[PDB]
Amino acid sequence: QRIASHSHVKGLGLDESGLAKQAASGLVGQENAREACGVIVELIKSKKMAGRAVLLAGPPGTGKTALALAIAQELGSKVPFCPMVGSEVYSTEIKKTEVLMENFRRAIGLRIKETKEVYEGEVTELTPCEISHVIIGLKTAKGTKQLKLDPSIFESLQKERVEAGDVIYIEANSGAVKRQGRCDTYATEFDLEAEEYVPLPKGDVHKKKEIIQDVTLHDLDVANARPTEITDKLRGEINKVVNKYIDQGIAELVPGVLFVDEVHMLDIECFTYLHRALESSIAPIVIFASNRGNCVIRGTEDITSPHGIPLDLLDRVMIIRTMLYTPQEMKQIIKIRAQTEGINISEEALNHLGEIGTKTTLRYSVQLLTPANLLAKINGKDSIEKEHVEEISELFYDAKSSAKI
Amino acid sequence: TQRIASHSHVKGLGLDESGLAKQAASGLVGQENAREACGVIVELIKSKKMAGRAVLLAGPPGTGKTALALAIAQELGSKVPFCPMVGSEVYSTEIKKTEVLMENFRRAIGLRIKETKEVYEGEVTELTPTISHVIIGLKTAKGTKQLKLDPSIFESLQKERVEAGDVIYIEEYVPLPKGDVHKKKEIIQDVTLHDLDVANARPQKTEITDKLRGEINKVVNKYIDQGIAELVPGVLFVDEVHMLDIECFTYLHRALESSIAPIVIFASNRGNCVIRGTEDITSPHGIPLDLLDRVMIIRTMLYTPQEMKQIIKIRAQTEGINISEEALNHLGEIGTKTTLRYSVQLLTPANLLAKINGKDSIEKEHVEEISELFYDAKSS
Amino acid sequence: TRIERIGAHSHIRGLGLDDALEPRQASQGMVGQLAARRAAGVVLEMIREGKIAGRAVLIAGQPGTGKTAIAMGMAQALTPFTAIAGSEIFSLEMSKTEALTQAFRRSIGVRIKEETEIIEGEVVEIQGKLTLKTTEMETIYAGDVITIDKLQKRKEVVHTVSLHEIDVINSRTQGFLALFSGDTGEIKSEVREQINAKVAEWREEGKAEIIPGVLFIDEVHMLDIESFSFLNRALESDMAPVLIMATNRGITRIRGTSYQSPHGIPIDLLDRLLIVSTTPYSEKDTKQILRIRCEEEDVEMSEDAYTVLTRIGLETSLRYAIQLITAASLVCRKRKGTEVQVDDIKRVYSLFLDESRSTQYMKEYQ
């Protein structure tokens, strides 16, 4: 199944009353932050509040990325979730303001389920006998039909090779995709026609297909700008046509959710565009993440501010606290990886690995869980014993023992 | 549309016959030495004597150097081109600095070109159907005239299509080309070198100095001595000259020593500062020692409190409303407290609020209430 | 569920003044700020009249007075308005001079009255002789649509076009550059002289007219000195739209240089700003604007909760107390009740915290 680094996330475990369970979907800890993120996912699912900002204040090494992934998995596939690395902003050819604004347009999306009839082409109905009137038959495996087409489609027909045995896909907006060499063309058992040899296209003539599709506005802007957007003519036209599409009853808007990591490592001009553009009435909700604490804002060289965030940006932002843990549940979290791994472990090796986890950090034990099972597979043991983990604790060193040597 | 700006009351310099002083000289008041120092150099501008000179302006913020920089150009009229350019337009990312500076120098220096031409128009009659003789009739509202033309002109007309009785420019649509049988016209206009450099670049952009110097100066030399082109330079004005990179200072006081260089008036506002690009330099007026030996330093005085009435009266004449005695007294007091720009700034919203409340004049209590509404930058 | 439903401080429609330009205590707009809203009404009347040019108004005060709400009220009560940030003109393909110039010249609008003669319709011939598939007329002098410009109609069209004619004269076609920003530094003589001459000829012929615009530049605490040198000529130019600067910080060192000046500005832009300072909100004003903001998402509160909300919003920031009712409405919805309580807002205050709560608890430094 190709399990990634963390695959514990399958939910967030919120009940109807609004309580937080002790162990739900491998997310043990922080019931206050559990309720604080339940409030904001209810705010996302309520579809009434846009223009908010969430900061996850905590020490480095708590696992707030798993909390954001739990938010994204509770939302699922309906709400578009696009995380942004802080190093995705520093571009060379495109300015950073436009990158942040295009991320804000990646947030906002719509869904306008529709229809589309397929035509699929007969074999040979090249009848230009009028040019306004073209008769094209169809010979599919279900049977034969005919249709009259206005001259165009035919002007797309003579552009491509229309010979004995071709496919003609005709869309609703005169979008013709054509092939060559179908059905049968083996006349005298001769050489290559150098075409595509496809069997019979089983299926009838007239289907009525319905697809629910989520469309982002940035793909719309890319498809409309080409045959840095103007904020007086282009995006206002997009806003007007989306207003017309939702007033006629075609598309349905969904709110935008973003998640930004290493926010404090951005430039101060990105900050003064960020807390100016989140003041708009159309601004999506963006969950910010600050990694380290009190440092210097990039571009100031003297201004001291907490969490690397200026005073104008630190205001009007909700703050959720994520503190450290207690060691007596660390052996539980390793167990959450064990049922993810598929190989059961013993009881004393869990104790030694929990001792190594409470020695320096939990992530060191989580990363050493994999070579323990690897040496258990090499040596032939069905479970992980204490000798393999006590050998891999001495063979592989962390940053503290590397700074000690 | 007049579009009254800040310095819209300034008409000209106002020198009477010798160029010494006047008080109500249809513009800015006071500044006798500055008016003399800018009235000496206009004879050099109009006479085309020297080239590569520089004029330095210095003083506190509020001396009105923009007014004299406009008045030195309005006295010249449309004959001498005036193109101001601050150091912010020199700063750019894609195009470099010296290219924009050379385009500014080409916007300065201009040409005057005359031309005589003969224009023929009217409807035509032909009889010719090529032995040294072409009959061409020409009918206009003044009458008819027959002409004999060369067979090469008739061959060139035979190359295209000729309608029997059309309008042919011999050098349902086009009804009645009114005019006589021949139009001999001599017209003189002006040529900017920036458009010539663009047309050399894009006939339908960093440049090498060979086309810049030689390919222009050779045809200018061949066209002056014939009696067609006349070289007339321009006057440039560079505001905030102390806010420049030191490489720009090296380029400026090299290019002022060239043989082909117009006159440029610098504007230095601030005093000692650190020159950008270098460190630990406390040169006066943001200018190094090399450029100070080339510029003409003009010192501007401070305005007296008596001449504030002469400043505000022409602004009230431009706006078109009278000022009472107590209102003028309070405006003079607040013009002695802070700079005169704050006194000029509170002329329009006072008149607008008096138009709203229904006051045909300006009250001292009215300007007192609008000064209570917002205060100056000094007590921030 | 349409695109803008609620955001930051913009819920009031228009701006609220009177014939004597005095704001009320319970009306449209915000509660309080008599001198600030009075000066905003005076400069908005100056914009509506349009007598002179070069009017730069600076607004200042403590963080939390709502300059954005005043800007949105002046925008809705206003004509092309434009509100830009301090980093939009900072680009890589364009310079810091061309982008600010395009931000200046975009707010200027042109009304164009154009009368054309159009003969349109369906064919009924070919080969030259013109008639229709008419309802009305005949007399020559299949199925396609042909329009001929000089049935017959003299159509009058009003155009509201910005100064992006400078975009279309330098360009070859009108399809490419009319959808994004465009090229690098162009011919400035083509921008100034030919445009001013042709618009002056259009004014003399009486075909088109011009109207100015408003540009709101927020967060001017950080700005390079290139823009400060550009505004010496930009405010002293022949024509320029009105500028509303918003500066939050009092004393800030200018990036690139080393100076100590108020509002991060030099002496040249110091005397060119009509400076309006504000006043922080009192008890009754905060309680009244909370009573206004309770009517946003149709959320009712108990009697003993407004005092607690105002007590939290007085010590902490005001926008935190604005967010508290939104964070408590979901808990009240999950409670299945039509009225919030004291324990609800105390639980929301225990969940979400502010800078004054996180100042003490960050003493670990691990």
Binding site: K233, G236, E237, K240, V241, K244 | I113, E115, K117, I187, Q189, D190, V191, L196, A199, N200, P203, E215, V219, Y223, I228 | V157, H159, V161, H164, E165, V168, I169, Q174, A178
Partner: peptide, 30 residues
């Protein structure tokens, strides 16, 4: 099918005395 601004947009000293000043005609003399 909307469109914002365009229906169709709008967008004598010369006389043979300046074409000789330019070398940017088809003849590249070198």
């Amino acid at each position: 099918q909307p469109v914002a601004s365009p229906i169709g947009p709008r967008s004598v000293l010369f006389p043979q005395q300046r074409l000789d000043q330019l070398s940017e005609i088809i003849e590249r003399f070198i």
